[PDB]
Structures are given as structure tokens and as C-alpha cells.
């Protein structure tokens, strides 16, 4: 276990290899770790509030239930990392790379997350609400019963995601790309879907969604 | 040609088969002709405002431009009568059979059409603001430039009608039948459609219609 002074001198010299390193309940607030490499870095209730991780490699690393509170994580390499109830509101993970990563149940309330890739993320019963994911790739994610209420999806791929039980109130899906993915009737009657490209299938589920009879 | 005396004289005396009789531009307001044989009748622009016609023969009748304002035609046999321009509005035609009827340019304001058959019947250009079609049976009909402005088509049969043009705000759709169809696109942003049956090609122009893309 490494301790905030020793780390921060380290990084003040220069030293940008972390990986595999002991940080678990480390207090980071405010701290500048851009381009560091926490890969595989046990941060598991780490306080990181405000602290600035751009362009860090954070692949793999536990970050369950940590505190990245307004933390910048652009174009940050968070690629399976565990974040598992971790606070993320008003953080920027703008060009992130949160492929694989496990969010689920995470603060992401006005986050911004544009641009992002959550390929196959798990970001089930997460808070979105507010947060920005314009140009963001959800490909095959798992939104089940996530927060979207006036989140901004507009040109998302959304292609193969799950949004069962997503609130979707207010939610903003415009030129985003939705085939193939699962989604409640209520998701056609709240989204605004200006440009949304759909499957015929789902094009049939939101005449239904709208109470005309198929049969 | 027979006047006014003359027919009503010989319907008080029980006849009824006035056939191919020419009774154009008559004078007959008011009057009462129910279950009176009128097939081929020559009724050009004749007056038969608030007549009582119910259950009568008016088959392949010319009714052209006549005025049958507030006339009684509930299960009048109207099948293949001339009525184009006709004079119809709040007439009750309920249980009317009219189909091959040419309703073009009529004047179907607040008419009530329930239970009609209107199959294969021409009302291009006929005004049926407000009139009401509950149950009425439209397949293969012609409503090209209609206006169908408040109209109630519930339980209506569209099925292979022509709404090419239709003026369709406020019009009620609530579980007509629609397959075949043909509509433009703003019927389905304009009518209230709960129920309303529909082709997979036009749940697609539904969603199209309410600007999804399905490329």
C-alpha cells in the first residue's frame, strides 16, 4: 500500500508506473494523475473528487465504489475496469474507453460521457439522468433498469443494447442508431426519436407502442 | 314528367312503383316517399330537403346535384345512385347501402353515415366534415381529397380506401380496419388511431411518418 505522499512524490518526479498498485481508500481529492498507469490499480473506495486522470490507463484497475466525483477522465483507458457503484456525477470521461467496464449501479448524473466507447458495458441500474453521451457507442450494453431521464443519447449507437425498465422520460435519442436493440413500448411514446434509425420489427413495435392493432 | 300533385297523390293512394319516372327539378320538401320504388328515378337537381326516404329504392337513381339536406335515407337501397354534388348534409343515411355510389363533390356535412355500406364507393372531393361513419364500411372506397375534418370513421371499414389527399384533423380512426390502405403520411400524425388495424408496410410509414428513419 502506497500512501498519498509517496505516490504524489512519484508522480511529481516522473514516475508514471502504478500498475498493480495498492491504493484502496486512498484520500486523492483534487490530485493531477494525467497519463498515469493505474492498470490493474486496487482503488476500491478511493475519494478521487476532482481529481484530474486524463489520458490515464486505468484498464482493469477496481474502482468499485470509489469517489469520481467531477474526476476528468478524457480519453481515459477505463477498458474492464470495475466501477461498480462508484460516484461519477458531472464527471468528463469525454472519448473514454469504457469497453467491457462494469458500471453497474454507478453515479453517472450529468456526466458527460460524449464520444465514449461503452462497448458491451454493463451500466445496468445506473443513474444516467442528465448525462451527455452524444456520439457515445452502447453496442450490445446493458442499460437494464438505468436512469436515462433527460439524457442526451442523440447519435449514439445504441445497435444490440438492453434498455429494459430504462426511465426514459425526457430522454434524447435523436439520429441515434437503435436496431436490434431491446426496448419497452414505453421507450417509443418518451424518447424523442427524431432520425432514430429502426428495425422493421421494431418500426411494428412503435406503431403498437402507439395503441394501433397488428394482429 | 310527373309533378308534385301527381306523385304525391298516387304515393297517398298506396302505389309505389315510381320507376324510371322523370321527376327532374321537382318541388318535393318536406315530403314523405319511405319504402317508395324510385330505381332509375331522374331526380337532377331536384329539392328533397328533410324528405323522409327510408327504406326506399333509390337504386342506380340520378340524385345529381339535389338537394337531400336533413332527408331520412336509413336503409335506403342508394347502389349505384348518381349523387354527385349532391346536397347531403345532416342527412341520415344510417344502414344506407350506397356501394358503387357516386358521392363526388357531395356535401356529407354532419351526415350520419353508421352502419353505411360504402364499398367501392366513389367520394372523391366530398366534404364529410364532422358526418359520422361508425361501422361503416368503406373498403375499396374513394376518399381522394376528401374531408374528412372531425369525422367519425370508428369501427370503420378502410381497408383498400383510397386517403390520398384526405383532409384527416380530428378525424377518428379509433379501430377502423386499415390494412391496404392507402394514406398519406400525415393521417397517421393527424388521426386518432387506438385500435385502428394495420399492414406491416404501414406500421412502417407510421413510424416513418413520426420521423424515425428505417433506411
Request: charged share 20%; net charge negative; aromatic share 2%.
Given at each position: 500500500?502506497m500512501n ?15 500498475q498493480?498498485?495498492?491504493?484502496q481508500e486512498i484520500?486523492?481529492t483534487?490530485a493531477?494523475?494525467?497519463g498515469?498507469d493505474?492498470?490493474y490499480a486496487n482503488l476500491h473506495?478511493?475519494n478521487?473528487?476532482r481529481?484530474n486522470?486524463?489520458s490515464?490507463?486505468?484498464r482493469?484497475?477496481?474502482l ?11 480519453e481515459?483507458?477505463?477498458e ?8 461519477l456525477?458531472?464527471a468528463n470521461?469525454?472519448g473514454a ?9 454507478a ?7 460524449s ?7 454493463d451500466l ?8 451527455v453521451?452524444d456520439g457515445a457507442?452502447?453496442?450490445?450494453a446493458n442499460?437494464n433498469?438505468?436512469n436515462?431521464?433527460?439524457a442526451?443519447?442523440t ?7 438492453d434498455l429494459s425498465?430504462a ?7 435523436d439520429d441515434?442508431?437503435l436496431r436490434?436493440?431491446t426496448?419497452?413500448?414505453?421507450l ?19 406503431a403498437?407502442?402507439?395503441?394501433l392493432?397488428?394482429?
Amino acid at each position: 500500500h502506497m500512501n498519498v505522499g509517496e505516490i504524489l512524490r512519484h508522480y511529481a518526479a516522473g514516475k508514471r508506473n502504478f500498475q498493480h498498485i495498492n491504493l484502496q481508500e486512498i484520500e486523492l481529492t483534487n490530485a493531477s494523475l494525467t497519463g498515469a498507469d493505474l492498470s490493474y490499480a486496487n482503488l476500491h473506495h478511493a475519494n478521487l473528487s476532482r481529481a484530474n486522470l486524463r489520458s490515464a490507463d486505468l484498464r482493469n484497475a477496481n474502482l468499485s465504489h470509489a469517489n469520481l466525483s467531477g474526476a476528468n477522465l478524457e480519453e481515459a483507458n477505463l477498458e474492464a475496469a470495475n466501477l461498480r457503484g462508484a460516484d461519477l456525477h458531472e464527471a468528463n470521461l469525454s472519448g473514454a474507453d469504457l469497453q467491457e467496464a462494469n458500471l453497474t449501479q454507478a453515479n453517472l448524473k450529468d456526466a458527460n460521457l460524449s464520444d465514449a466507447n461503452l462497448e458491451q458495458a454493463d451500466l445496468a441500474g445506473a443513474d444516467l439522468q442528465g448525462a451527455v453521451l452524444d456520439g457515445a457507442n452502447l453496442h450490445g450494453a446493458n442499460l437494464n433498469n438505468a436512469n436515462l431521464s433527460e439524457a442526451m443519447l442523440t447519435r449514439a449507437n445504441l445497435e444490440q443494447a438492453d434498455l429494459s425498465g430504462a426511465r426514459t422520460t425526457g430522454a434524447r435519442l435523436d439520429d441515434a442508431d437503435l436496431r436490434g436493440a431491446t426496448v419497452d413500448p414505453v421507450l417509443w411514446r418518451t424518447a424523442s426519436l427524431v432520425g432514430a434509425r429502426v428495425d422493421v420489427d421494431q418500426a411494428v413495435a412503435f406503431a403498437a407502442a402507439h395503441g394501433l392493432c397488428l394482429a
